[PDB]
DNA sequence: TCCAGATACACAAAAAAAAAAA
């Protein structure tokens, strides 16, 4: 059989040693004199590397005159293999990429080697036993996988580690950011827990049906279009971009919505919703998507559009992740579940800006004398829960029960944190603006 | 090419064992009947075990009657060949060095067998590169020799119960022995119930999301690093090394973690911070590693040259045992579980070091009127309760209600202990500081 | 097609009725004159028949006689063929198994001929209907299980178990034991009200915490340890076998419990406890366990085991069943218990050695104004009383009435027991010592 | 096979319908056997059958 | 058939951000003995010379 | 592999009773 091996990359790497020369430095680091396969390829890999070590410029002529020297220009083929080397070279921007094919065809031809030589054994034992049969397999195979090293993924000492947090800590000293290194939320007791909304971070907003999750998200929103200066996307998938917008403006301009629908205004409610509609057209930083059934593909590659088009995100919302569609999995909904989640977590990776994605709860809530929420009560939700970054619920006492003292007042729920505090933040609630706000009284 | 057999070895352990059948709980634990070359052979064997475990008596004749019931006589080549076989044995007293070598003949032919597989995996990759095709071969040679471990797990008699409990007693009696024998915990209840972190055992610390699983271990392994001499090395999959350095600080120095993060100090928190850096450059003996989804092979290559470069190891910390990757398992999870929990005890018993495997529960324990976990609550809980030598909880009541009077109180429980009592304890939870502290 | 039979196992059951004699009782019940299929190996059994029930010792010269006093010589292989069917006989221990070998060879040729005689009269009705036919298949077939005469489990006359439990009477009348017929337990009320621990039974010694359960339990142990001479097994799911070794040491040697524990002794103590021990190395007939949340099917091996090693046992004990575990019942707690008890009464039955299982007692004892505990007290346990055999309490009534004038004494009240009276018992208690007396005065 | 799931198939149908031709539908339903339990006899909108999305699509 | 093949290796080696050219392309194929059904390297290489130039990809 | 409907045993226990404390 043809062991496996790869001439056309030996070539490759030839051709771009020679014809560039600035990028010797990652070359020399990735392949060996023993690498090559063909006996002229070795020699003139072997009679480049001297040339190159010996500091002295690499070209085509002196190449030549260096085999001529050794009398090894006639053995590698003669000039016009070099020259025909020399021009058959597609460029030299992907000669790591052949040198990792040529280490990788090494490798896995000494280890091809290795196993011929460990089942030669045991059709002569030559006098060893089992014992040492077995013994001698595991160095072998240790020493043909000690030669590659995993870079920079190893071990490492306190020493390294620690200088760096230094170096760290001490550049933080300076330009504090009033605690806030994320996206402002608005909300200066969240801003405490959470540091803001870090980027690359998967933020899930769960709760009862009716309960305020859609304006919670919605305010989010709001605040970091309104501050920061790049777009923030919404995908809609459960209400149109109108009614969105009117919550906004009740929300922003601090008009009743249900005025505002009907269209029963004053003069100064007006006033109020023209001066938010000079603010919202002055800005010019939200986008609005309405589509119904969307696949996470879809989602990725509007996202993309996006972010390419105006240079990069802000916040992206997702209402809800459960809405979602993958035809490839239409018979089983954990599954499809799980793909949606992973692919979500993915894209806020992908695109380094934070995702509030909505979620609901299971009906096992109610069945229980204690009405807060938990993490299993989200639907399907081992990979809802394993791949999320923060988790916030949102309770309200006077739901459940009318009588209770926290009337008029919302309690968020940080059920998980892995770099943050826990615990809970009361907020006012004014549903009759689709508002949440900061507790000034006690 | 002839591979490696003997025939006369199966002949003789076949006559012996139909001229008598008291000794066939001494060679049934030796040989399988997979291991015989020739089928005949193997149907053989099989008839054999089938009419021993049945509890009738063996001999020739109901042999011969049970190859019939399933039209298998002709095959073997009929009653005379058995009859040839215990004819012409000549006695039974050396059966159990024909079973030994029928054995090695086996696992060489074995061996044999799976050098030639790793040598055809390598001439059609099918789009696997060489660190799959080196993992998947460290992973056949090592399964072959990692099967050797059962006749375990049996109760005890009078004897040997009696002279622990004269040990323990002789150990109580003499002063000098400080109630710890292997790595101090630093926790009083906790060096009282489990009497340290014991070598060549597994310990799996279990709890659900947001409850200190990983400032537990941190505390644990600094602890370690602090009093041993020998190194403790630290697999951390999920976390950033800066952000482990940071709550080590904050731990150690006695600062606020929030502090560290923002960048607001005062002078005291900058000369306790000295302090403590000091002292950690003065040992160094922390060896972290942040890769992300290790396979068994390479913790282990990475465990093994460590302790070859400093000659030992005291603590190993995995953070943890649900993100390593199994390549030949991708399609089952159950099988990847077992083999991840096997591969840890494995390195455990080899480098006779302790393995700290962190664990996660699964969600139908929240459904519950009590939360606090059980042995039955575990992810794919049947492997790594078999193979753990000590399980550990990690439960905070003030997580689920906030006005419960345990605050600041963790509790531990010890739900599994091979050689030691059950149990609880109590610990001091101080969060801004990310540290386990002692229970008034 | 060849019928089912097999020639060697005939010739292997007329050897070995040819070579010994004193084991044909052991094997007439099984075999009958027509069962055999070889028409001379039917005639030289039925001659070997004739010549047993006649009393005449059997060898080749009475055959040989025989044969030529019904002139068969010839028409049975000659006496070389005699002297060959009782030269290829290994060995005569395994006759049964050749008999009965050759009985279900004669009950399959039976079973096919009934079938092909069925098939046959299925193409020839000969002027009847299907309702007939019907009839006549099950007629034949069920002709064939009512001439099977041997048949395993089933419904059983009236005469065989009288017989048997009239033997059973007689031998135990025979063997004067005092009136104890079981497992001494140590106490003489108990045993005059309980006649010992019987075997197939669940025993279910209960009380509230801290009230002398497992002392008593190991009281119960170390006194049949002590006497009996099989093997006991304990399995503890509480504590490891070093507390139950000490106290078991403290009670035998008669040392405090706290000095053990604190490592302080004397001389005399320290000569006793050697004592204890040089006796209990001698005797070595127990087996302590520790394995948490054991399944049963785990403890049921691991008894077979142990039983099989030492060739019986003499008692079980488990500490406590409601820590055991069904892992395909995790949902519902009171079917767990049940497949629990379900389970230990089976392996007693099994085993044939009693079984003591402990379990513990609901807080609704507290609220009543009886403190003394019923059956209905035991915690998720409709089979543990509907199960059981004997159900012991333990009852101090110091523990709630310091003023009682009963101080030291725990009073047994046996609150079940199918084949026995019910009452109650008084014995003293020992705390200093660990350790349960009989009551005087 | 999955009641569950064809009675959230039928309420997204209705909603998709609604949407889709600009009309007000009511969709009555029934209610679970729970609330017999309770000394409130009063209705909750989790005593709805088979109601995940009933109660999550419901306007 | 083959172009559908090519599809998914240009997609796949572009995909991770990897540079593709003949060489890597032409490697990847034969990992799997999927560039004899391609048409070989001469396909490729015909196919990577007869296209002056991307301006109307889209 | 989750969600939803329904029969039955058990845990107390929960309050209420309520006895009785006042
Ligand atoms: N004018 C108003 N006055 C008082 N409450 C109002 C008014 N308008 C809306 N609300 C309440 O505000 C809340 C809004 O709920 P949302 O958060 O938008 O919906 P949701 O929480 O996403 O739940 P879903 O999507 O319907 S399952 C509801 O509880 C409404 O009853
Ligand atoms: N920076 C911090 N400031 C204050 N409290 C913190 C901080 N980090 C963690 N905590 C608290 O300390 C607890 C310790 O949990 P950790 O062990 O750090 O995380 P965890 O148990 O690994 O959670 P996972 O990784 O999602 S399973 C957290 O649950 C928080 O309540
Ligand atoms: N030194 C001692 N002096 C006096 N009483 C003691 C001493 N040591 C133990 N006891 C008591 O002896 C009794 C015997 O304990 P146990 O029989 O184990 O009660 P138990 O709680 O039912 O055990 P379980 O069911 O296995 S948890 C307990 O009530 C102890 O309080
Ligand atoms: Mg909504
Ligand atoms: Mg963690
Ligand atoms: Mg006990």
Redesign the interface.
């Known amino acids: 059989?043809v062991p496996?091996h790869?001439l056309?990359?030996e070539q490759?790497v030839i051709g771009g040693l020679l014809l560039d020369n600035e990028r010797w430095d990652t070359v020399s680091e990735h392949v060996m004199t023993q690498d090559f396969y063909s006996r002229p390829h070795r020699l003139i890999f072997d009679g480049v590397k001297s040339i190159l070590e010996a500091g002295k410029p690499l070209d085509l002529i002196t190449l030549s005159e260096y085999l001529e020297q050794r009398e090894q220009l006639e053995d590698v083929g003669g000039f016009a293999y070099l020259a025909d080397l020399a021009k058959n070279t597609?460029?030299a921007?992907?000669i790591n990429?052949?040198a990792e094919?040529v280490a990788?065809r090494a490798?896995?031809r000494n280890?091809?080697g290795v196993?011929?030589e460990?089942?030669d054994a045991?059709?002569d034992?030559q006098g060893r036993?089992?014992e040492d049969?077995?013994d001698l397999?595991?160095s072998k195979?240790?020493a043909?996988?000690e030669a590659?090293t995993?870079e920079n993924?190893?071990?490492?000492?306190?020493?390294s580690?620690?200088e760096?947090?230094?170096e760290?800590?001490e550049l933080?000293?300076?330009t504090?950011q009033d605690?806030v290194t994320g996206v402002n939320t608005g909300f200066t007791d969240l801003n405490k827990k959470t540091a803001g909304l870090q980027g690359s971070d998967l933020i899930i907003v769960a709760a009862r049906?009716?309960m305020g999750k859609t304006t919670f998200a919605m305010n989010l929103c709001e605040n970091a279009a309104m501050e920061q200066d790049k777009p923030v996307l919404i995908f809609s998938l459960e209400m149109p971009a109108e009614q969105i917008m009117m919550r906004m403006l009740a929300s922003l301009s601090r008009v009743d919505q249900t005025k505002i629908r009907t269209g029963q205004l004053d003069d100064e409610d007006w006033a109020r919703i023209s001066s938010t509609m000079g603010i919202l057209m002055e800005k010019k930083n939200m986008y609005i998507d309405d589509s119904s059934g969307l696949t996470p593909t879809e989602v990725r590659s509007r996202a993309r559009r996006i972010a390419r088009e105006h240079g990069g995100l802000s916040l992206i919302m997702v209402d809800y992740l459960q809405l979602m569609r993958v035809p490839a999995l239409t018979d089983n909904?954990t599954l499809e579940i799980a793909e949606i989640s992973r692919s979500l977590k993915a894209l806020a990776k992908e695109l380094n800006v934070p995702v509030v994605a909505l979620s609901?709860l299971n009906?096992?809530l109610?069945?229980r004398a204690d009405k807060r929420p938990?993490?299993?009560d989200l639907?399907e939700?081992?990979s809802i829960?394993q791949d999320a970054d923060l988790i916030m619920f949102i309770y309200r006492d006077e739901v459940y029960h009318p009588d209770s003292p926290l009337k008029g007042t919302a309690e968020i729920i940080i059920?998980?944190?892995?770099?943050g505090?826990?615990?809970?933040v009361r907020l006012t609630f004014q549903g009759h603006y689709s508002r949440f706000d900061n507790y000034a009284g006690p």
Do not use: C, H, M, W
Request: net charge positive; proline share 9%.
């Open positions: 059989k496996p790869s056309e990359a490759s597609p460029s921007a992907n990429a052949y094919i990788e490798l896995v280890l091809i196993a011929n460990i089942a045991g059709y034992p036993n089992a049969l077995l397999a595991e195979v240790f043909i996988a590659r995993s993924e190893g071990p490492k000492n306190v020493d580690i620690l760096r947090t230094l760290r800590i933080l000293y300076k504090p605690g049906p009716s909904r609901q009906r096992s109610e069945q938990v993490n299993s639907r939700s081992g829960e059920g998980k944190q892995r770099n505090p826990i615990g809970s």
